[PDB]
Each structure stands twice: as C-alpha cells, then as structure tokens.
Amino acid sequence: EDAPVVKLVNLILTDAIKKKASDIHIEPYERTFRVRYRIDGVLYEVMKPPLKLKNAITSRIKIMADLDIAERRLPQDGRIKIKDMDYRVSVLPTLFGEKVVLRLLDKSNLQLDMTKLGYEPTALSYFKEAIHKPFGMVLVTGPTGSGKTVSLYSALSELNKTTENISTAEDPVEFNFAGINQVQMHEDIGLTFAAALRSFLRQDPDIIMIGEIRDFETAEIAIKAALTGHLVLSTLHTNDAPATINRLLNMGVEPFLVASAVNLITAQRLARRVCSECKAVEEIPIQALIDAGVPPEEAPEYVCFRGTGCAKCNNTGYKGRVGFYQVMPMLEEIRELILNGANTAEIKRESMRLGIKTMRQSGLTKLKEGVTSFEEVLRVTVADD
Amino acid sequence: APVVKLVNLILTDAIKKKASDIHIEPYERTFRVRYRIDGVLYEVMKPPLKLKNAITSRIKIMADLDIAERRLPQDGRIKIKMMDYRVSVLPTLFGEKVVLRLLDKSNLQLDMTKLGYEPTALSYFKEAIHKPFGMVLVTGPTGSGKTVSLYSALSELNKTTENISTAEDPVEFNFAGINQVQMHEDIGLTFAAALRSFLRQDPDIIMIGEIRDFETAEIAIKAALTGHLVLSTLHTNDAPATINRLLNMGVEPFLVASAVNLITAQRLARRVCSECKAVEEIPIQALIDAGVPPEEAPEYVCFRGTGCAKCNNTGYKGRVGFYQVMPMLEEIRELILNGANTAEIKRESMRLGIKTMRQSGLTKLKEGVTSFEEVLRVTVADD
Amino acid sequence: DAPVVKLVNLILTDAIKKKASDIHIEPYERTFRVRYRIDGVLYEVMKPPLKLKNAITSRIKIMADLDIAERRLPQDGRIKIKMGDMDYRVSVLPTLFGEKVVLRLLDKSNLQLDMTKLGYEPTALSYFKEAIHKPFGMVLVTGPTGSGKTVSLYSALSELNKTTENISTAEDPVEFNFAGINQVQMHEDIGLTFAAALRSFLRQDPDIIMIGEIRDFETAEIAIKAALTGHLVLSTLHTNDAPATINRLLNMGVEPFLVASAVNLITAQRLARRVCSECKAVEEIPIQALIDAGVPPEEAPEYVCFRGTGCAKCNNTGYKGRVGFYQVMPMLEEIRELILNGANTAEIKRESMRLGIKTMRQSGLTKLKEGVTSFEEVLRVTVADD
Ligand SMILES: [Zn+2]
Ligand SMILES: [Zn+2]
Ligand SMILES: [Zn+2]
C-alpha cells in the first residue's frame, strides 16, 4: 500500500532501544492502530500509524522472522537479529488483523554479574556456593516479572564453561546464549518441560535449567535429576522461600527427596526505584519503621525518600526497578524441620534464626541505602511478625 | 392487520416492555407471541393462524435468510432504525418458530458498581481483580449475567498500561484497546492454542471465555500461577462446587489452592416494581426456614408488586443479582489440600462471613428490592 | 554429501581413537561445534562449517533409522559400527537453532550372564528359574530402557542354551552375538518385522523363542499363541510394574484367558545405584520415614541405613555400582482368577503382595537393609506400596 515501510519498521525497533524499552506491542483495531513500548513494566502509546500500512508492517516483520505471510488466522513465533541486536517475535490473530509483540534482547542492558544485581553480601555468598556445587537443585522462586530468570542467566554465565553440557527448557526461550543448548517449549506437539527434561537425561548433561516447575510430573523428574548427579536450576511461584518447601510437598513429592536434593531456595521480587531527579524526603515516624520491622537502634539513621513526580520519571516518581532477595540455603537445621513435618511459619523462623534475611529485610536495606520508597517496600513484601 | 406493521409492532412493543427475547410460536391450533421479561415468558399476542407463514417469512426477509428453505433451521440478524436483534428460525412440526434476542449494547452496564454487589462482596471482588496474578472464576448458568460481571472486570482493568488479551467462543463485546481472539477449533484455534500464544507475547491480564475441559483448565491455572491475571467462567451451582468441579476435571489440588484468587457465583432474580410496591405479610416461620435469623425476622419488611402499568402487571421491573463471592482464603486452601468435599467448604466459607446466594438474596429482600417468592424461586436453602 | 559423510566418519572415528565416552554435536545461531567427553570432561574437538549443521545431523538420523522429516521434537535411536565393535545410543534434541545430536558409548564390558549374580533375591530367583525351565509358556521381563531387562533376558537364555533346544530370537537390534542361538535382526524397511520373523519361527521346528519387545498387538497376539502351542516365549515390555503389564496386554486386545493360560511369569525391574564400599557411612534415618516407606515397624529400628560420604573411588558421588530391584510375579491361580473376573491393576498388586510377591519398593528396602543402597535411592527409583 506504500513504499517507505522499511524506514518505518526500522524506526520502531531502533527507537525502542534508545528508549530502553523491554517490549514492543503493535496493535491493530477496527478504527485505530497503535504501537506501545513497555518501559519498566508500563506500556506507553508511542505511535498511531495509518491503517493502510498495517499489513505492510506485519508482513515486513514476518519476512524478517521467516513467518508465513499467508497465515493470518493462527499464531506464529520467530526471531529477528539486526545490526548485533536480536528480537523475539510473537504474532497473534487479533479480531482486526495480527498483533505483533517484539521483546528487546540487548545484552548491553542486561546484567549478568551477580555482584551488580543488588544481592546483599551475606546472602550472595550462599547463592554462589550452591550454583558452584557439582550437583543438587537450586530454586529461584517468584512470579513472572520478578527478575528470577536474570538470577538464573547470571548463574549460567558464571558456569558456562566449555567443559560442561548446559541444557535449557523455557517457555519461551528469551536470550540466545552461546554454548548453551536452549529448547523452547511447544505443548501442542508434546514438547513439555517433562519431555525435554526426560530427553535431557538422554543427552549426557551436566547442568539443566528448567523455566518453571508447574506440575508434579516435572517436579519429580527435576528432583531425581538433581539426585543422579546433575545441577538442576528452576523456578516456582511461591510467596517466600520457606513456602517453597511445602509447595513441593503439596505437589506430592516425598519430603526426604526434597531435603537431600535441594541445595538452595532463592526468593525475590522487583520494586520500583526512586527517580534520582524529583527525589524528596518523607518524614516517616520511627514507630512506623519499627512496626514495619526496622531494628529500633537503626530506626533514626533511616532517611526515607520518595519521588514527587517529574518529567524524567513520567510523573511516576520511579525509574528503574530494584530487587528484594531472600537466599535460604538448605542448612542442616532446615532439613530436620522438613522431616519433622514442619509448617511454613516454623521454617521461616529458624531461617531467620540462622541469619537468613527475608525479602522485607532486604527491602529495608534498599530503603536505607535510599533507592526505594517506604510504600514500595510495604506494597511488595510482607512484614515478618 | 397489516403484516409489515405488525412485525414492527411486535418488535417495538418488546422494546417498550424492556423484553430480552421474543418468541413467535406456531402450533397445530394456536399461534402466539411471547416476550421474555425479567427471565419469565408471558403470552403477549394470539394472532390469527393465517398469518403464521406471513410473519415468519417477513422476518426472514428482514434478516436476509433463505426464504425457499422452511424445513431446516436458519440464523441471522436484524438492525432497525431507532437496536439490533439476533434471529433464529426452527422448523417446528406446524410451521417455523422464530426467536429474536435483543442486543442492547448501548444501554449495557460495564461497571461493577452498577451490578448490585453487596459492599463486603464487592470489596473482595475488587481486591482480587487488582491483584497482580491469580485466577478469578465467575460461575453461574446461562442467563445469569456472569458474562456481564466478567466484562465489568475487564472494563475496570482496561488501562493503557496493561496488555489485556482475550479468547472467546464467540466474541460478545467488541472492545477497543483489548486484543480479542475469536476461537476457531476447526482450524486448530482452541482456547488452549490461543492461551499458549498469550504467554509468549508479554501479557498482563488474560480473559478466557469459559473453562470447559481439563486441557483448558490445567493450562489456564498454570498460567495464572506463573504470575499472570486470568479471568474465566464455569457452569457450576455455587462457588464451592467450582473447586470440586476443577478437581473432578483432573486438576492437581495445589494449583486450585495456590492459583485461584476468587470464585464468584450468581443468579438473577426479578426486582419488584417501584410503583405498585406493597408490603406482604410473610409468616415469620417462613423467614426462619428460609434462613433468616429469628432475632431479625420481625424487622424484615417483605414486599410484593400489586400489578400496575409500568410493571406490565407482572409486579416486577428489571432484575437484581444474588452474588456469592468466595475469596480463596487461607482456611479454604487448607480444606482443598485435606481433600474436603463441597459441603464442608461451603460451611467454612459461611463461617468466615462469605454470604451464600440465599443469604445475599435475603439481603435484597430486606432492602425491599425482591419478593420473598423470588428468593425461594431462584435459590436453595443452606442445609 | 561428499564432505559431510567424510566429516561424519571423522567425528565417529576420532571419537573411537580418542577413547571418548560421549559425542556432542552442537549447533548454535552463528557457531557449530563437536565436543567429545573424555574421562567425564568435554573438549572442543571440531568447528565444522556452519552450512553443514543441518546436513550432518540428518545423515546421522538416517544412520539411526530416525524420522528426518521431524526436526521439532526429540528422538532417540541406536548405531552399530562394527570392528574386530562399538555401538552407540543416539539422542536428538530440538535446540532453538536446529537439532542437537548426542552419542553415548555402550561397550557392555562388564556383562553378567549368571542369574545368581544379578542381585535377584533367593525367593525371587526360584520363581524365575521355575518359569523359564517350564517346557512352554510366556515369560515377560518388563521395565524401562536402561533397567537391565535385556540383561536379565539374555542371562535366562544362557541357562537354557543347551544343544538339545532350538532357540531362535528376533531383536531390533540384536545385542549380543550368541553361539547356538539363532538370532534374527529386524529390518522394518524390507518387511522383516517381529511378526514376520515370529511367523517363520513356527515353520522352524522351534523350542525357545525370544522377542526383543512386544510393542504391538500383531506381535503380542502371535507370541501368546506360540506359548500355548508348546513353545517357550520370552519378551519385554515397557510398563511400570508387573501387575500393570497384565492390563497392558489386555488393553492391546488380548483375550484374558489367553493371558491367564499362556503367561507363566512377569518380571519387572529397575536399577539403583550401589553405595561405595569405601566411603560408606551409616546414616541415622528417622524411623517414621521407614514405616511410611513401607517397612513393617516391628523390624524397622534394626535397619542400619548407609550412604556414601564421597571418596576417590566413587568420584565423590557416594556411589559405585548398580543394584537391581526386582518384582517377579508368577501367574498363580489367584491372579489367574482375578484376570478372568476383570480385576484392575491395584487388586492384582494387592493379591500378589498377599501371596508374598515382593514389590520393587519392598525388594529395594531389602537391599537397603543389606546395606548396598541408600534410602534416597530407594525413594528415587521405586513407588510406595499404598
Ligand atoms: Zn522523577
Ligand atoms: Zn408495577
Ligand atoms: Zn566412595
């Protein structure tokens, strides 16, 4: 329908990099057509192109990704690599044409260094200890969008030596890693996690990464792989790390296997980072900090900040995101609790007895260093009564 | 009586009477027209039988339906000058029966505040919809407004900062800014098919028309556990049964416990006419057996409609909703893992202050919006 | 094909010369490599040209009789390259950027053909020897791949390999070249299926017949009919436990009285790791866990559970050898009666346990008591007995 589509498409992808966007959404509707950038978890409408180019745009992208242009009724998935910048494409048949989703994959703005992820010193020591063990299971819990896969990616980079077979099963595979054998799931064809995980055992493996353990079938296989002499990395969506014990048991797993096989259970969430420009002090009462869980001796030296709202923060008061981490090694004391039928709260206490900081405590540490607001800590975490 | 005018008459009269569906029914010795008003069919007209074929054919002409085929069923639509209709013709033994369903998207409420939730219930409903993940199931039978409650949730979340994706069979409301996918199983576009694609496209909120099978249920729940917000419906009696429906389908129990945030259940009841509103002497023993606590039985003021022009002598004008909103509370999660049956769960929910549909119905009765008969008609006592 | 077959041949030959244990053919977005596992560590060996990534893997799939039109889901097969030999098990895995192929060496150097040395418990072995030395009937040895089921099968043939008996065999592929055993290797492309070879055996004045695996109704039906005619039939299936193997055959379409009359025994087995004899350490396992594992409480405290600490001999794994957990279920009158009354799997499992047929879990707990395997290894490999 027109000719300078390639200049338009190139702009939409490039501008997304300049804006440090994480995802691109190209959405056609009956009378409107829009482009949205997801930046720090929030979608902003960027472009409202003319509808005559909607089919020109999608087809230009589909050829870039080796997708069937005649198929506008079923969803398609491919990849795009541009000059050294690759994208992940997903096409979906909206009511009025195909919706396109591109996720930005630039390592340049991806941190693969555990030191730079905001782990506290004591916790990070436990995290490195478990991933460098020669076998066992390491679980990084959290929901989607909590940075949990970034913790995994940084671990694989530390382990990605040419002497070890690292296999990977994700839904979907995001970052193409060199020397790492990544498998994207496809449930319609029978390529489930268990299917790849069973195939991995037939693949002379050393390290195995699983996107998430969602059902008993996958859990059993993943644990037994960690027992057979393999390093198993995976995620679950649990509230805190102590609950991940009774999550696996509620799935139907025998407890003695959980005690023997799990080496570590990380739990983390992402919180908004205050804008460095409209940064304003908030006089929070000391009893409010104590009721939040701050040790009283350190309550006065706290200087709680917040963003007023400016242009740079798009009036959100926040810019980047920041992580609250809980790193709970499977200490001898925790193993005994699992076998005596301990509940979640009982495990939570003994972990804190042994100096295992909760996500709330990690948040109060970020608050003290002045990167997050008091509201954002209470929003994301739960107090440790 | 002219046929074209009469057809327009039966369609317009249905609008004035706020009817939802029109039934044009030929039989061996009679011919009648019925309006669906507040869920109940009333005989409206008894035209002469000679016009049975004239009327149905006129409607088919209005609907662009094959007039040469009177032996097989046909389906179409009508849009007139003011209001669109959905038409279905069915070959009865004695002529064609025609059904028109009124499609009132213009006067359609897509705001949870206008749905008649009681304050406590609405608080739980809002709490669960604004959570960053989890499943919300809106149960009820066909014609219970459950799809209206579902869309009301989407409208509440429909901000430009969130990717709301949707899979329906068929799509009901064409929504702007909502990425809607209409199902097509013959080409392989099932709920499971679209739902798998949604995860690969950076979603925030997902709506699934209905959970009909294990395949869709398992996938939808696992997606809601992964950290996405999933909305769907089922056809179950109350909210507690929706738990053992999912479990009887084959879902692993921890998923039902961990992933579901809330289960709504609803029925529709007639609303008493505001004009012929008369108090009705209901015996107190009847109220206590209905579930009224005896201490509060005298202060109930039971109403009924006498019959006026505005209520079309029905005594009722418009509908009112009886809702049961059961958040997946820590206590109920515990029951699921201990293999509790449905009746046990209903008890613990009621212990924790989750009004049943009967209890919600009696609340509208006390507020003077429903008749006592309409409570007993629609719900079942809690024994 | 000219440079790919040369390259394919190089990858297999160099792997033999370099005494590799596993071969890794790895495609990536812009790179392509082959790694050999030598003494547990992978070394980068070759960096072939990227144009050949799909050509090489596909040729190997042909060498393994693998569907080459299917490049999306994983596949597994075998390769036998002969000498004066070395066979491999191949696995294809659909990476994001093509198919990854892995070859594992199967040298079978330590091969036991003495039923006594397989770790069968005494009561079990007696039941097993009884059925194979019966003059006819069927004996099924079930289990997953890598459970020694074919080793138990061959060990049975060695006990029967006398010069008075016509032993014919149909395998896909033939494993061990046995003297005096008439071995027929399957060749599906030319019509040499199990059923095809099985039919010819009846025309061959047979005594004992071994079939690699009963995977199909055609094969199952005839093999059963052969065991009724007065021939000894040995085969395998991939089933969870011995009682379910009955309802496996029944779901295939076999009439139940045939299963009752023709089956003499159904073995089921799984392999578990053997604790290292050098770093062997006693482990205080809680008693309630043992009772819940299925140990009768009266004998539970006297259990002395071991595990490996980690030494040089065990490569710090704590384990060395393999150990077998066996379930041997003779077709006793009680089980035949259940089969004829349409009993389900759980009922048969119960009645076998009433009749003293130790399950794989129960057999595992005995090896645990004898101090050859760990408690974790019992739970990993077996299933609790309700
Ligand atoms: Zn700012
Ligand atoms: Zn009235
Ligand atoms: Zn050792």
Residues of B in contact with A90 (CB under 8 A): 197, 200-202
Q: How far apart, in whole angstroms, are the C-alpha atoms of residue B323 and residue A12? A: 47
Determine which helix (DSSP H) or strand (DSSP E) holds A265, and give its type and residue range: strand A262-274
Residue B122 token pair: 């609405």
On whether any CB of chain C is under 8 Å from the CB of A163, the answer is yes
- Given a contact cutoff of 8 angstroms between Cβ atoms, the answer to whether B241 and B344 are in contact is no
Residue in A307, A303, A349, A357 with CA at minimum distance from that of residue A328? A357
Residue C314 token pair: 């065990």
Sheet with A318-329, edge to edge strand ranges: A181-184, A166-170, A207-210, A231-234, A136-141, A262-274, A318-329
Minimal Cα–Cα distance from B254 to chain A, Å? 6
Which residues does B285 contact at the CB level (< 8 Å), separation at least 6?
none
Chains in touch with B (≥3 Cβ pairs < 8 A): A
The count of C-alpha atoms lying within 13 angstroms of the C-alpha of A309, restricted to the half-sphere facing its C-beta, is 2
- Given a contact cutoff of 8 angstroms between Cβ atoms, the answer to whether C84 and C91 are in contact is no
Provide the resolution (angstroms): 3.1
On whether any CB of chain B is under 8 Å from the CB of A42, the answer is yes
**What 3-state class would DSSP assign to B45?**
strand
Q: How far apart, in whole angstroms, are the C-alpha atoms of residue B221 and residue A268? A: 22
Burial state string for A197-215 with b = 16 or more CB within 10 A and e = fewer than 16: bbbbbbbbbbbbbbbbbbb
What DSSP line would sit under B251-276, residue for residue? Answer: --HHHHHHHEEEEEEEEEEEEEPSSS
Return the amino acid letter for B252.
Answer: E
Residue in B224, B227, B289 with CA at minimum distance from that of residue B263? B224
User: Which residue of chain C comes nearest to A161, CA vs CA?
Assistant: C42
Which residues does A64 contact at the CB level (< 8 Å), separation at least 6?
A9, A80, A89
Q: How far apart, in whole angstroms, are the C-alpha atoms of residue A362 and residue A270? A: 11
- Given a contact cutoff of 8 angstroms between Cβ atoms, the answer to whether B144 and B266 are in contact is yes
Q: How far apart, in whole angstroms, are the C-alpha atoms of residue A7 and residue A19? A: 18
Q: How far apart, in whole angstroms, are the C-alpha atoms of residue C69 and residue C212? A: 27
Instruction: Say whether B161 and A42 touch across the interface (CB within 8 A).
Output: yes
Phi-psi region of C236 (alpha: psi -120 to 50; beta: other; left: phi over 0): beta
On whether any CB of chain B is under 8 Å from the CB of A368, the answer is no
Q: How far apart, in whole angstroms, are the C-alpha atoms of residue B41 and residue C122? A: 79
Other C-beta atoms closer than 10 Å to the C-beta of B187 total 11
Q: How far apart, in whole angstroms, are the C-alpha atoms of residue B246 and residue C311? A: 50
DSSP-derived secondary structure letter, B355: -
Largest alpha-carbon pair distance within chain B?
Answer: 69
Is cis: bond before C135, omega within 30 of 0? Answer: no
Residue A41 token pair: 């978890």
Determine which helix (DSSP H) or strand (DSSP E) holds B22, and give its type and residue range: strand B21-26
State how beta strands C263-275 and C319-330 pair.
antiparallel
Torsion sign across C-alpha atoms A107, A108, A109, A111: positive
Alpha carbon distances (Å) from A269 to B321, C2, C26: 39, 55, 35
Instruction: Say whether B188 and A74 touch across the interface (CB within 8 A).
Output: yes
Q: Which of A163, A204, A261 lies at the smallest CB-CB distance from C102?
A: A204
Return the amino acid letter for B131.
Answer: K
- Given a contact cutoff of 8 angstroms between Cβ atoms, the answer to whether C138 and C227 are in contact is yes
Place of tokens 């004829």: C340
Chains in touch with A (≥3 Cβ pairs < 8 A): B, C
State how beta strands A279-281 and B316-327 pair.
unpaired
Q: How far apart, in whole angstroms, are the C-alpha atoms of residue C235 and residue C225? A: 14
Question: In degrees to the nearest 10, what's the CA dihedral of B138, B140, B142, B143?
Answer: -90
Minimal Cα–Cα distance from B61 to chain A, Å? 29
Torsion sign across C-alpha atoms C258, C264, C268, C269: negative
Q: How far apart, in whole angstroms, are the C-alpha atoms of residue A275 and residue A269? A: 19
C-alpha angle with apex A203: C13 to C186, nearest 5 degrees?
65
CA of A362 to the centre of ligand 1 (A): 24
> What Rg, from alpha-carbon coordinates, does chain C have?
23
Residue C280 token pair: 């062997």
Residue A53 token pair: 């180019």
- Given a contact cutoff of 8 angstroms between Cβ atoms, the answer to whether C291 and C252 are in contact is no
Count of positions (residues) in chain A: 385
On whether any CB of chain B is under 8 Å from the CB of A332, the answer is no
Return the amino acid letter for B249.
Answer: M
Minimal Cα–Cα distance from A74 to chain B, Å? 7
CA of C344 to the centre of ligand 2 (A): 64
Burial state string for B157-182 with b = 16 or more CB within 10 A and e = fewer than 16: bbeeebbbbbbbbebebebeebbbbb
Question: In degrees to the nearest 10, what's the CA dihedral of A33, A39, A42, A44?
Answer: -30
On whether any CB of chain C is under 8 Å from the CB of A183, the answer is yes
Residue in C223, C232, C218, C234 with CA at minimum distance from that of residue C258? C223
- Given a contact cutoff of 8 angstroms between Cβ atoms, the answer to whether C307 and C281 are in contact is yes
Question: Counting beta carbons within 10 angstroms of the beta carbon of residue C342, is it exposed (0 to 12), middle (13 to 18) or buried (19 or more)?
Answer: exposed
Residue in B2, B17, B89 with CA at minimum distance from that of residue B51? B2
Torsion sign across C-alpha atoms B45, B51, B52, B58: negative
> What Rg, from alpha-carbon coordinates, does chain B have?
23
Determine which helix (DSSP H) or strand (DSSP E) holds B74, and give its type and residue range: strand B74-79
Q: How far apart, in whole angstroms, are the C-alpha atoms of residue A12 and residue A37? A: 9
User: How far from the centroid of its chain's Cα atoms is residue A15's Cα?
Assistant: 24
Instruction: Say whether B200 and A172 touch across the interface (CB within 8 A).
Output: yes
Residue C362 token pair: 């129960």
On whether any CB of chain A is under 8 Å from the CB of C74, the answer is yes
Place of tokens 């033939």: C174
Minimal Cα–Cα distance from A104 to chain B, Å? 11
Residue C179 token pair: 């003297």
Q: How far apart, in whole angstroms, are the C-alpha atoms of residue C120 and residue C268? A: 12
**What 3-state class would DSSP assign to B189?**
strand
Q: How far apart, in whole angstroms, are the C-alpha atoms of residue A242 and residue A248? A: 11
Nearest-ligand number for the alpha carbon of B303: 2
Q: How far apart, in whole angstroms, are the C-alpha atoms of residue B80 and residue A351? A: 70
Burial state string for A247-281 with b = 16 or more CB within 10 A and e = fewer than 16: bbbbbebbbbbbbbbbbbbbbbbbbbbbbeebbee
Determine which helix (DSSP H) or strand (DSSP E) holds B174, and give its type and residue range: none
The count of C-alpha atoms lying within 13 angstroms of the C-alpha of C45, restricted to the half-sphere facing its C-beta, is 24
Determine which helix (DSSP H) or strand (DSSP E) holds A332, and give its type and residue range: helix A332-339
Domains of chain A, each with CATH number or no CATH: 1-104 (3.30.450.90), 105-385 (3.40.50.300)
Residues of C in contact with A134 (CB under 8 A): 316
Return the amino acid letter for C32.
Answer: F
Place of tokens 């060749």: C187
- Given a contact cutoff of 8 angstroms between Cβ atoms, the answer to whether B156 and B129 are in contact is yes
Alpha carbon distances (Å) from B325 to B154, B221, B350, B360, C270: 17, 19, 11, 10, 50
Alpha carbon distances (Å) from C361 to A130, C294, C301: 31, 8, 18
- Given a contact cutoff of 8 angstroms between Cβ atoms, the answer to whether A115 and A124 are in contact is yes
C-alpha angle with apex A96: A93 to A101, nearest 5 degrees?
45
Residue B299 token pair: 């202060």
Q: How far apart, in whole angstroms, are the C-alpha atoms of residue B348 and residue B354? A: 9
Residue B292 token pair: 């009224």
Residue A48 phi, psi dihedral angles, 5° rounding: -130, 75
- Given a contact cutoff of 8 angstroms between Cβ atoms, the answer to whether B192 and B185 are in contact is no
Binding-site positions of A for Zn(2+): 275, 278, 310, 313
On whether any CB of chain A is under 8 Å from the CB of C289, the answer is yes
**What 3-state class would DSSP assign to B90?**
strand
Residues of B in contact with A142 (CB under 8 A): 227
Residue A182 token pair: 């990544």
The residues facing A265 across adjacent strands are A139, A328
Instruction: Say whether A92 and B198 touch across the interface (CB within 8 A).
Output: yes
Alpha carbon distances (Å) from B107 to B40, B41, C90: 21, 22, 66
**What 3-state class would DSSP assign to A317?**
coil
Other C-beta atoms closer than 10 Å to the C-beta of A180 total 23
Alpha carbon distances (Å) from A82 to A17, C30, C217: 12, 13, 54
- Given a contact cutoff of 8 angstroms between Cβ atoms, the answer to whether B150 and B231 are in contact is yes
End-to-end CA distance of chain B: 55
The residues facing A140 across adjacent strands are A266
On whether any CB of chain A is under 8 Å from the CB of B201, the answer is yes
Interface test with A, best of C295, C379, C385 (most A CBs within 10 A): C379
DSSP-derived secondary structure letter, A223: H
Residue in A107, A189, A183 with CA at minimum distance from that of residue C97? A183
Residue C296 token pair: 């009768």
Phi-psi region of C318 (alpha: psi -120 to 50; beta: other; left: phi over 0): left
End-to-end CA distance of chain A: 64
Is cis: bond before B170, omega within 30 of 0? Answer: yes
On whether any CB of chain B is under 8 Å from the CB of A344, the answer is no
Residue B372 token pair: 């006592």
Residue in B180, B164, B181 with CA at minimum distance from that of residue B231? B164
Q: How far apart, in whole angstroms, are the C-alpha atoms of residue A380 and residue A326? A: 13
Residues of A in contact with C73 (CB under 8 A): 186, 189-191, 195
3-state secondary structure chain C: CHHHHHHHHHHHHHHHHCCCCEEEEEECCCCEEEEEEECCEEEEEECCCHHHHHHHHHHHHHHCCCCCCCCCCCEEEEEEECCCCEEEEEEEEEECCEEEEEEEEECCCCCCCCHHHHCCCHHHHHHHHHHHCCCCEEEEEECCCCCCHHHHHHHHHHHHCCCCCCEEEEECCCCCCCCCEEEEECEHHHCECHHHHHHHHHCCCCCEEEECCCCCHHHHHHHHHHHHCCCEEEEEECCCCHHHHHHHHHHHCCCHHHHHHHEEEEEEEEEEEEECCCCEEECCCCHHHHHHHCCCHHHCCCCCCEEECCCCCCCCCCEEEEEEEEEEEECCHHHHHHHHCCCCHHHHHHHHHHCCCCCHHHHHHHHHHCCCCCHHHHHHHCCCCC
**What 3-state class would DSSP assign to A154?**
helix
Q: How far apart, in whole angstroms, are the C-alpha atoms of residue B377 and residue B152? A: 26
Q: How far apart, in whole angstroms, are the C-alpha atoms of residue C308 and residue C276? A: 6
- Given a contact cutoff of 8 angstroms between Cβ atoms, the answer to whether C256 and C336 are in contact is no
Other C-beta atoms closer than 10 Å to the C-beta of C154 total 21
Residue C306 token pair: 């071991």
Return the amino acid letter for A99.
Answer: K
Residue A96 phi, psi dihedral angles, 5° rounding: -115, 60
Return the amino acid letter for B51.
Answer: L
The count of C-alpha atoms lying within 13 angstroms of the C-alpha of A101, restricted to the half-sphere facing its C-beta, is 25
Sheet with A76-82, edge to edge strand ranges: A42-47, A33-39, A23-28, A97-105, A85-94, A76-82
Burial state string for B88-122 with b = 16 or more CB within 10 A and e = fewer than 16: ebeeeeebbbbbbbbbeeeeeebebeebbbbeebb
Nearest-ligand number for the alpha carbon of C320: 3
Count of positions (residues) in chain B: 383
CA of B375 to the centre of ligand 2 (A): 18
Which residues does B255 contact at the CB level (< 8 Å), separation at least 6?
A215, B218, B221, B222, B225
The residues facing B370 across adjacent strands are none
Residue B111 token pair: 């705001």
Q: How far apart, in whole angstroms, are the C-alpha atoms of residue A282 and residue C6? A: 73
The count of C-alpha atoms lying within 13 angstroms of the C-alpha of B240, restricted to the half-sphere facing its C-beta, is 20
- Given a contact cutoff of 8 angstroms between Cβ atoms, the answer to whether A356 and A328 are in contact is yes
**What 3-state class would DSSP assign to B368?**
coil
Here the contacts of A293-299 (C-beta below 8 Å, separation 24 or greater) are A293/A360, A293/A361, A293/A364, A293/A383, A293/A384, A294/A364, A298/A368
User: Which residue of chain B comes nearest to A214, CA vs CA?
Assistant: B222
Residue A144 token pair: 């989607």
On whether any CB of chain A is under 8 Å from the CB of C42, the answer is yes
CA of A49 to the centre of ligand 1 (A): 30
Residue in C362, C143, C355 with CA at minimum distance from that of residue C248? C143
Residue in A170, A174, A23, A159 with CA at minimum distance from that of residue A107? A174
